[PDB]
Scaffold this active site. Structure first.
Site, short mmCIF file in Angstrom:
data_model
loop_
_atom_site.label_atom_id
_atom_site.label_comp_id
_atom_site.label_asym_id
_atom_site.label_seq_id
_atom_site.Cartn_x
_atom_site.Cartn_y
_atom_site.Cartn_z
N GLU A 1 -20.15 -14.58 6.96
CA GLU A 1 -20.53 -14.92 5.59
C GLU A 1 -20.54 -13.67 4.71
O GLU A 1 -21.25 -12.71 5.00
CB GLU A 1 -21.90 -15.63 5.57
N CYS B 1 -23.86 -21.23 -0.48
CA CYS B 1 -23.72 -21.35 0.97
C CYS B 1 -22.69 -22.43 1.37
O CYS B 1 -22.34 -22.56 2.55
CB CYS B 1 -25.10 -21.63 1.58
N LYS C 1 -42.95 -19.26 -2.24
CA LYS C 1 -42.57 -17.92 -2.60
C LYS C 1 -41.08 -17.87 -2.94
O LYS C 1 -40.24 -18.09 -2.06
CB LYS C 1 -42.85 -16.95 -1.47
N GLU D 1 -32.19 -23.39 6.66
CA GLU D 1 -30.85 -23.49 6.11
C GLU D 1 -30.34 -22.07 5.97
O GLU D 1 -30.80 -21.31 5.09
CB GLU D 1 -30.87 -24.21 4.75
#
Lengths: 475, 476, 476, 476
Positions: free
Chosen positions: A378, A280, A172, A246
């Site tokens: 982040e 990332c 997906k 991750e």
């Protein structure tokens, strides 16, 4: 335009709520795509289940040739894949043609090799009269979810090792970037046996959730944010599913007094902002030594202000927009809160960079502390913060005092400082005198709150296989 | 008179919370009452782990290897006393512990000392032009480890050696009923390792265990226990993305084909179905037998199981010990009863309690069991082995793979062809051919599906406790 | 008084043949006259190794590993005594042997005890449908092993442990000048290993060594010596297609760039050009020095090299020993004289013999040597270092690589970029950066080109002494 | 017409020297006359390799891997004509080449593309405090490679792929009778690789091979041939300490126990004793049959072997082809005739020349042969199989091991126990069980003893072509 979900033998459209795939350069709609129904999810998993029977019994050479073919297929349509990924994400076209596609194709090809090259402790008599050997077998059915930042690449990272390991997969893509995955689905359908790869689309809250909670799925691999990693991990707690996570990073960039400051400024200009910071490994949390600190902030400020985005001629754009409005707002929000802090300065950018679509101004946040949200969190946007440290300060320890552990870099001409930092940094990756550079033989993946499991390299393939001990008594 | 204190940093310390009644499970008599770790002692242990990490994580493979060599020596020097302590605490027959357990434990510590200096990775080089890459395997951080009660000391070796050898620091908790060999070992380790590398707390899973695994500073949790506890640990780790290392039990299928050496099969199961009173993750307990041989197998195993000796005064003469506690016996009994309630099922021998005092159950054979039966579907963890018939139009391999478990298995046949086909298709962490149960420290143990993931023993245990790091240096 | 006898299977024996005059190399006086092995005795050693192989080749990694651990333990018990015997035999300063060599030797045995249990290979599995393949690493056969005089006891370790570890049996010969520690070790080994697994004989290369290299039952020959003996061994092996393991010398290039820490560079060379009187395959001997710093380096090196202590009564005050023999000293001296003959060459210090008694040579600096000079082209194996200048025009690495040698090297600079680039391009088994000489048992030592091939220390040593085998089982 | 030009660096160049008469071994009629490389062209080819090595040794695995993939694509594009060329040059039945060889050759280039990017070594890290070590596998230098005539194109793939893959450059010589496919492939490669990375020269062993293997710039020599040529290649390298990679033939023992499947044994020996006219280093040529089944096997084999089809006009129908040459045919005939003069040996079928025209020899069965017979002791390399009886007081494994060769072997038994014991004890690079002959590119091929060492196929061949380098950086 390829619009259809791949489920076993057949392509079929969605049955559920449609999603509004937007072109993030201008805010206009590209297409509306209906999500998969619960029934559609069920049949995909089922087709994966029945395909595992044959697929798990294939030889590494058989699986490797499949991967090579997939690579040939993407390579043939490299230009079309690029343009379609440049549309979906508003990535400048040449950055996609030159950087992404060849890594992508090289990735399918790396794993063709890795499949035929797994090692293990040697076969032999560990006990007298008993010959032991180690195998790596498939695991089962994999539910895989990709994020929106590098759609087609993430697909390669998720499919190739799991399929290479002899697993079957239900994949997906992110709700907003399903496009390249449906085009790929078509080519894959012609190469693999039915149901080895299945591709469903939809929102995570509904389609993602049903996939990761489906009893037949033995492993779930996700790349996304922490919130979602926690959801996946909580869902695994139900049926003891293997997980591969991750969950992003906040890459520290330690810049010492004796660094080539010109190359540092150029490094952050590219790698702090590439993909509008929606990467990332973005070079986003900078530690600058006291001596060069003011020089760095100014030189970088000057450099960042020149970054070209949103021009009519896409070959001249260096940076695309953020994926959605919610994402731009989230970025705008982070910065605003930081600009609010009295000890912080926004030296360039800081506002929305677009009349239409979702661009943000490349931004530099100066004077940030270890305590600041901008340093702890982040931001996933074209935004870089800079923190000063003393000779009396351990910049490595500052860098390790973090929830994240994915990637990092250190800049110095000195060997002692470069090597000592490299041995002590608690990061999946540490670059010295560069940043961002990936290679398909070398593993990508974090520790701590960035999660566990690798992408790329033979370790990715080891994550999708089960080590088995077989011992034969000589009677 | 006995090793009773917790190891917290450089402090040896008696727990300050609720006491546990550690029982001689042969007699049910109280051996000793042990106060468990308070919340603050849990905190001090984790905090000593954190302080020790700084230094310990920067040690060389040779230093850590030498440390591991010394622990083995220390254990070896006191093998007699460790074995006698574990026999008392767990009721294991003294010579079984002496000849089987201690030598394997000492070998484990020694194995990992070698494994520590022998990690491999993709070769260093220029994969991108002008950039030298290399791969390291670094420590992960602070491990919380929890042991079960079936092999207290060996589980500790498995839990500690690869965690320590990876350059991690550890907070370790033995199970509530079996803390004694662990406290003893903690004394010896204190004199060998820098303080804070290994810390030992005692207590209940619901209290001490729960605080340990939910501690923000703990980076990885490793547990061997049952499925419920694993689902617990995974649920905790979900809160903070802790790494997990989970060995959750199994229901080892034993496929016996018609051309099997039937004597050898009987003798194997006699030992490996019932060793440690079936309190063993890899126990030969779910037998599949081809129609041709079913009836003979049932009778010969029945007769052989009935001669298994236990709870004799001369401990020399005992082949298995008791279950760990009353609650475990009661639970095993019920499995047996529910299964005997079935019309198609026959308890051919045993199936009743094996002592008034202590927690013995009789070695039991359950025949005529079907793939739908609870006795086949779920882990018993007592001296009980079930036999299921399979016919020629049936796939014994499919049948065995139709299970939530995936830890260990065996196949018996004189035919190399059937063996290899079986071995290749079994969805089990380990497959013995014409034996069962045999472990060797170089070979990984660990399962698939609901048995968990991660390995104990082998280089792989140590790869589970280190982080793979890519370092890339730009020349130009 | 001293261990004197050869190990031949289950028997310790005086050598039958002529005697070597084992000399004390710092006084020139005799230590002992020792009889060489006769040809029948070389036959008996090899026959005993053949009988031992039957059993030994069939032992488990764990068994062999335990055995190497016990040898480590044995050398450790007698460490002082080994040191003193090695010092006496070789002239080495007592504390260098005690602090440097012994711990390294012991750790070599312990390292290999682990490596024995940690060999990898491609995973087993079905690479062909219906066929299960696996990779084994089996023993090769009987190894004929020969050590040089430079580090008698360490070379023993480098040669015995991987070979024995791999499940080979061995017939070992120390150098004719240095059998003493080998025979002391031989007794110790005899009490640990099955008889015939290790065999120790004494004697000359052209007699005993020849008879061993050529024996038709010896399947592999391992030698550490000079290019000359290497060619002899290679030719001998040719007639019977024997496997060979050769470490044949080095002329270690030391590249010093303009931005080197000159203080560190000088102290590095002061130590590493002169350790063991430069009787070291890895000695820092061929310096390349960028023009900007050439002058200062020569002057600073000369000064440090002139302070090097040797031939003192307080053996704790000595830094280096004598050469092994009068023959070797005179060979070194003839090298130095010829270098002194060249107009462009200046000898800044030393250059002559350095004792009235024994075989000492003066630490020597040779300045202004160029690429076509003999003092650069050939291995001296004396306490002698040449220095050669390169300019910005010159590719210092290309220069270093222009050599028949390929064993070791170092590069000195504070610039990460230049250092990595050098390390990438140097054609040498080993490259140290900002140090030299440093060895670690997990890391391989071995050359390319005319330094030979094959490795000592590391798992690669053990790989050299094993045969990879493919087993493939048909299921159908 | 065909491809006849040599490949030296950038230029394609006709051979200038003595012509080789290239024959069609089916008819003994000339295909083409091809002039050999001069000493000058040999020197020019080595020199190109030298220049090309400066860049090619500096490439990434990724770019080398890509190059291998492209070479695979080019062979695949022209699969059929390579098939045709090899069938004509070698006399191989077309379908066998098309279906067995070409697939395996293409796959071989693709496997090494993989292997090139998947080299492992011990992990980087601080093995000595403050020093970061890493291990690299770097190129060796210039490779001189010599292929035999049994599988011209396959041998070339085995020689070139790991060589070029490891970043080396190559001067390659096909066998004198069989350069045709090599010269065709040469043109495709020149379009793919940089100039000089691969060089193809032709001519006789004695002239061209000799000069190639003796060139001072060649750092490694790889040859697959007979033992005689291996010995002299070894003698050459002895002078200059060149690395060697030797694959020198086999005499594969085939142990058939009483409980074997005799239909499968007979069907296996029918194919693999005789495939490629027995001109295969792994031919199933030396059979050991248990007493109980000795007579049936001889009879059944004899009749199976007499139906083997060769020398037909419909090549689709031919099962084996001829020997390469008159010299080879005659070499086999004399092997057979000398066996016939043994009174105890019986030639059950064939044993004579097999065609008026060309170099066919009749499929031959040699019954009653002994451990002492020439036919058992020495490689015949023809369509000839020998059968040798063994008893229960005889150790068939020990008998198999009493040989100079050590490449390949198989065991036939339905018994698990006997197979695993044989596999563990056999002294052969390879052991099949209940099959023979089957290769797979991930799995190493290569012998021990006089068969030589070093592997073809697998990551091991690539290890053979690379130098392990230890890089250590000081943090001080």
């Amino acid at each position: 335009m390829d619009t259809q979900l791949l489920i076993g033998s057949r392509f079929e459209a969605g049955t559920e709520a449609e999603e509004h795939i937007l072109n993030p350069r201008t805010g206009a709609g590209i297409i509306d795509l209906a999500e998969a129904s619960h029934a559609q999810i069920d049949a995909a998993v089922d087709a994966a289940e029945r395909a595992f029977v044959g697929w798990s019994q294939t030889t590494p050479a058989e699986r490797s040739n499949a991967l090579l073919k997939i690579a040939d297929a993407i390579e043939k349509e490299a230009d079309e894949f690029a343009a379609l990924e440049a549309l979906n994400c508003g990535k400048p076209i040449n950055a996609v043609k030159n950087d992404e596609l060849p890594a992508i194709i090289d990735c399918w090809r790396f794993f063709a090799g890795a499949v035929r090259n797994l090692h293990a402790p040697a076969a032999g008599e560990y006990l007298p009269g008993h010959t032991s050997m180690i195998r790596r077998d498939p695991i089962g059915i994999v539910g895989s979810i990709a994020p929106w930042n590098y759609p087609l690449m993430m697909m390669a990272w998720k499919l190739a090792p799991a399929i290479g390991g002899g697993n079957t997969v239900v994949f997906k893509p992110s709700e907003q970037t399903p496009l390249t995955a449906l085009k790929l689905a078509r080519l894959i359908a012609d190469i693999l046996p039915e149901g080895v790869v299945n591709v469903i689309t939809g929102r995570g809250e509904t389609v993602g959730n049903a996939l990761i909670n489906h009893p037949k799925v033995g492993m779930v691999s996700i790349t996304g944010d922490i919130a979602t990693g926690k959801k996946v991990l909580a869902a695994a707690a139900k049926t003891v599913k293997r997980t591969h996570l991750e969950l992003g990073g906040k890459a520290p960039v330690i810049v010492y007094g004796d660094a080539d400051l010109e190359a540092v400024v150029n490094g952050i200009r590219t790698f702090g902002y590439y993909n509008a910071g929606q990467d990332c490994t973005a070079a986003c949390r900078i530690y600058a030594e006291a001596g060069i600190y003011e020089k760095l902030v100014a030189d970088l400020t000057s450099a960042v202000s020149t970054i070209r985005y949103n021009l009519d001629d896409d070959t001249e754009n260096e940076i695309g927009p953020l994926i959605s409005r919610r994402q731009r707002d989230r970025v705008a929000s982070f910065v605003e809160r930081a600009a609010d802090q009295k000890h912080i300065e926004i030296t360039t950018g800081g506002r929305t960079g677009s009349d239409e679509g979702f661009f943000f101004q490349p931004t530099v946040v100066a004077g940030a502390t270890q305590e600041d949200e901008i340093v702890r969190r982040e931001v996933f946007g074209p935004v870089v913060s800079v923190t000063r440290f003393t000779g009396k300060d351990d910049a490595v320890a500052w860098a390790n005092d973090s929830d994240y552990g994915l990637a990092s870099s250190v800049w110095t001409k000195d060997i002692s400082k470069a090597m000592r930092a490299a041995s002590r940094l608690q990061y999946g990756c540490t670059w010295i005198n560069t940043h961002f550079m990936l290679t398909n033989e070398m593993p990508h993946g974090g520790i701590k709150q960035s999660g566990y499991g690798k992408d790329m390299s033979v370790y990715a393939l080891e994550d999708y296989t089960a080590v088995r001990h077989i011992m034969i008594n000589h009677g």
